[PDB]
Amino acid sequence: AEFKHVFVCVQDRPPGHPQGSCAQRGSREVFQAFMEKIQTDPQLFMTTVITPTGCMNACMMGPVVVVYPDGVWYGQVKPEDVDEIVEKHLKGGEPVERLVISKGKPPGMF
Amino acid sequence: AEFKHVFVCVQDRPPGHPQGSCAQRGSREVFQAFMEKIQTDPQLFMTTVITPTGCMNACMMGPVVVVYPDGVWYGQVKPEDVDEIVEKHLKGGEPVERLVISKGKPPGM
Numbered sequence: 001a002e003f004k005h006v007f008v009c010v011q012d013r014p015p016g017h018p019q020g021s022c023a024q025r026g027s028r029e030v031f032q033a034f035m036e037k038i039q040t041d042p043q044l045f046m047t048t049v050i051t052p053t054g055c056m057n058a059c060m061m062g063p064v065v066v067v068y069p070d071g072v073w074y075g076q077v078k079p080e081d082v083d084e085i086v087e088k089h090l091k092g093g094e095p096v097e098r099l100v101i102s103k104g105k106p107p108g109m110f
Numbered sequence: 111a112e113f114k115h116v117f118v119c120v121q122d123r124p125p126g127h128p129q130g131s132c133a134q135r136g137s138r139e140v141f142q143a144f145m146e147k148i149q150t151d152p153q154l155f156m157t158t159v160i161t162p163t164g165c166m167n168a169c170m171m172g173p174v175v176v177v178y179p180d181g182v183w184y185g186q187v188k189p190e191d192v193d194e195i196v197e198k199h200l201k202g203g204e205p206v207e208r209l210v211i212s213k214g215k216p217p218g219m
């Protein structure tokens with residue numbers, strides 16, 4: 001039906017870093033969990049892109065994932081969460097509210 | 111302005127890789143250009159974020175730059191293009207058509 005673009009922060013930072021990083025919090029497995037879940041559905045594979053990014057400024061809330069054009073921001077995402085997001089949101093067009101940290105704009109921005 | 115999220119591919123690949131990369135095509139200078147624009151402009155930071163990414167699968171037309179929520183895809187962006195994109199697009203709200211390679215969906219989809 002419509003194109004959806006998923007951005008997963010995979011920014012890594014040293015272990016004792018003040019802000020920590022999404023990678024340290026497992027964001028790389030989240031990115032990979034998305035990839036294999038999309039390449040597994042003929043309809044999603046042709047209407048959904050998953051891109052790895054550097055820090056998006058919401059580290060305390062990592063792993064951070066933002067879905068455009070929706071502008072939905074997810075936080076503290078775990079690999080086991082990917083499935084529900086893909087089914088309920090990417091397909092059903094309904095955001096998984098328990099993980100949403102912001103909408104229309106980044107967390108903290110006015 | 112409004113709110114705009116700019117994504118600049120800064121993916122790089124070793125010299126032997128056939129596809130090369132936006133980073134080899136000068137995408138890091140583009141990114142830094144945008145970042146110099148965000149600090150040097152009075153109101154842009156109020157409605158704008160720039161994010162560096164890995165490959166977005168439009169390598170032949172790199173440097174690739176996508177702007178959301180719009181869903182506008184730019185190709186072959188040079189540092190010297192940033193300014194016109196910032197003023198004409200990020201503020202004015204109108205895409206610099208000579209660099210647009212797609213809208214609403216990735217190139218070739």
Ligand code: FES
Pocket residue numbers: 009010011012020021022023054055056057058059062063064
């Ligand atoms: S490290 Fe992921 S948002 Fe900062």
Ligand code: FES
Pocket residue numbers: 119120121122130131132133164165166167168169172174
């Ligand atoms: S390396 Fe930039 S789009 Fe592929």
